[PDB]
Amino acid sequence: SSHHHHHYTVTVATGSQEHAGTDDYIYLSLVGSAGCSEKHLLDKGSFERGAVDSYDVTVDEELGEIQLVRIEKRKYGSNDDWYLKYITLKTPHGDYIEFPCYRWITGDVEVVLRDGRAKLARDDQIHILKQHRRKELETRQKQYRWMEWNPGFPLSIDAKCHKDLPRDIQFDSEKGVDFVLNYSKAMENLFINRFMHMFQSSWNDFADFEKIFVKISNTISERVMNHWQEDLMFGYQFLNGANPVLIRRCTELPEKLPVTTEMVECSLERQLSLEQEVQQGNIFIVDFELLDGIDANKTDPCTLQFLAAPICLLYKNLANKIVPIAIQLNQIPGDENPIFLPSDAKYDWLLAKIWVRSSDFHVHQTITHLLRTHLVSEVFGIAMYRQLPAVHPIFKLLVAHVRFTIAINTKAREQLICECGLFDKANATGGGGHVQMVQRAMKDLTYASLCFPEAIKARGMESKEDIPYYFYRDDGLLVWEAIRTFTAEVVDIYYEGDQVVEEDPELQDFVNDVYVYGMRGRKSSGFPKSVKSREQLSEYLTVVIFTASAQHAAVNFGQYDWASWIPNAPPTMRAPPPTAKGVVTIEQIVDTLPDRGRSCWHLGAVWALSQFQENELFLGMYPEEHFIEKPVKEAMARFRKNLEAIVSVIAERNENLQLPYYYLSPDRIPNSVAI
Ligand SMILES: [Fe+2]
């Protein structure tokens, strides 16, 4: 695809996208320490998609060391956008200089690119480079401003629809990544259009839903189908499901749950008492205080949707497996909030489990998944684009991990979770309830909650010896330390010491745009207002990236496996929680379960949101060479080797498991949060 033009040897790399070529005029200038260059007109032929064009440009006079490159595109007619990858120069004196672009040029502005050697402001001392940097930040801050989408929410990009973002942060495709289009296209692909708007109609039994499900089911999905009524599967999801972040070891029984040793005698397997067992550390808890006060979806007057705020008490049996031993569906005990038990009627216990699952699904969708992953990543991205110039070593590193984050969130807000959005179709927290969740969850979000080892230890889930079957933790720690090592290497490459980090003005303003605008300047978040050490900078970028890639994928890509069997992850409930024991029948649960119309939308949503791209970039795949220097390439190479080793470790582990756990295998962890 190489084309040579003959009258400095200039090589321009055009993008591989479906539209990266442009037929407009492209003029080029070389800005040197001893002079500037005329606007040289490139070939008249249109730059092609995936192209690499070479041109001979003769300078009238010695320009000295080439520092900057101006690129202008003037429309020949009907101006179309052009994705520039990089520009290489082979100078007369025998020097090869690479300028990474990787940006959309739509004629609107003249783009100015700098050498691919990563630089800190402290390194720049001449008017040429400094003016470029200052002006670059001026326009970055003109282009990337903050906005509050909903009160108490983290600040997001200033835009109403997708087309309102800078194209550099838009999707490569016009309508390529669309919630409406991909969800409906799945509902057709999954062969479920007949139920797309078939509300107020209930599935007559499990068998009917099962016959449609077998043809679309997966491995983990079919296991869920065969084992969703088992205490073992119920407890297993609390460690290795799609939302394995809520369980905490119980060191003292909550006073609000008046559970008794005599109540759990049958589940207990050590001849110890319930309190004695808590003293031993074998009792675990999942408390849904965050669902108390959430308003259920009232958008459908012909169906009442209901939430709960359960407290689930679980036990680690002689097999070192965590299984549920007690469930109270609401927060304040009484005569109408029974504590259901595995000894109760089959369907009392089953309905308790169904409600616990529904609550976990609501938390996952809103708190675990959206807020703590997407919106955090978007905050980091907006701060990045505002405060770190493209020549900064932190920008070159994070740009690949915040790719498609702003755009996916904006598309969500314009199609998915807006007022009367697709979210309200099947979820009971539509109409505003989920909004309140985020607000209430905000004050619980802290910088330590995003640091993985601290987060694991904070709930007491640290000991692999006492809690051996926590694969999510085991893989997460491997990946976290891998990324920490990679980030440490980069930091050490670019910061002589803590003084250089501390004196870095653009890093500090980036951190502060995260603290003030991202977290709203809330003191109780724990976010650094300034980084003064390389260990702290490493940890900060580690939080950023791990939230943007590994954690996000762990919370997203278990949705079709585990939520696909609706009884295992109900998006809504159509009856209030049972207030008495021995009064509920399997039929009544089927009637409490979602209708046929919401079924299709939930299934399509989890399937569409559970998808990898055909040419997706996984952890370490950095095709866009923003870094072009040798030491940083070696650091990336080591990153890749350690990741591949972890892939081997995780595969060998999966070979000996009932149900393998592949979500934290780096070969399935994208770079950024694109869904
Ligand atoms: Fe996600």
What labels would you give this structure?
five-stranded antiparallel β-sheet; Lipoxygenase-1; elongated; alpha+beta; Nuclear Transport Factor 2, Chain: A; Lipoxygenase-1, domain 5; 21 helices; 16 strands; five-stranded mixed β-sheet; dioxygenase; binds fe (ii) ion; 675 residues; 3 domains
What report would you give on this structure?
By secondary structure, this protein is α+β, with helices and mostly antiparallel strands. The chain has three domains: 1-116, Lipoxygenase-1 (Sandwich), CATH 2.60.60.20; 117-244 and 361-672, Lipoxygenase-1, Domain 5 (Lipoxygenase-1, domain 5), CATH 1.20.245; 245-360, Nuclear Transport Factor 2, Chain: A, CATH 3.10.450. The chain is built from 21 helices and 16 strands. Strands 1-5-2-7-8 form a five-stranded mixed β-sheet, with no helix packed on it. A five-stranded antiparallel β-sheet has the order 12-13-14-15-16. Strand 7 (82-90) and strand 8 form a beta hairpin. The longest helix has 42 residues, at 346-387. It is elongated, with a radius of gyration of 28 Å. It binds fe (ii) ion. Residues 369, 373, 552, 555-556, 673, 675 line the site of fe (ii) ion. Fe (ii) ion is lined by residues 369, 373, 552, 555-556, 673, 675. It is classed as oxidoreductase/oxidoreductase inhibitor.
